[PDB]
């Protein structure tokens, strides 16, 4: 690989979502006999929208979604007395 020589993983032609990142588009996963496999990471399912000059899609329903965003605000306030630390 561009990242380097890989030993103990079997290359598979099939592309899957990244599990462990080797680098340079190559990922490793443990898949089902079980063995570690090295593969090119998939970027997601390919979807072709049905674009037309006169076609539109309008939703006829909705889903109310609640999602969680976790943000760090503060860290523990620590004071180190240098004289005590350096000199016991």
């Amino acid at each position: 690989t561009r990242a380097g020589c890989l030993i103990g993983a079997e290359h598979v032609n099939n592309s899957y979502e990244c599990d462990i990142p080797i680098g340079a588009g190559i990922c490793a996963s443990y898949q089902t006999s079980q063995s570690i496999i090295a593969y090119t990471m998939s970027l997601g399912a390919e979807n072709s929208v049905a674009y037309s000059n006169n076609s539109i899609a309008i939703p006829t329903n909705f889903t109310i979604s609640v999602t969680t965003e976790i943000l760090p605000v503060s860290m523990t306030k620590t004071s180190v007395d240098c004289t005590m630390y350096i000199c016991g």
Partner: peptide, 24 residues
């Protein structure tokens, strides 16, 4: 409230079932 952090519960409206239509 979370320890040393905040948790935001975002409520969103997500479109669900789309029907194709002709348009002008």
């Amino acid at each position: 409230s979370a320890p040393h952090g905040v948790v935001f519960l975002h409520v969103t409206y997500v479109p669900a079932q789309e029907k194709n239509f002709t348009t002008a």
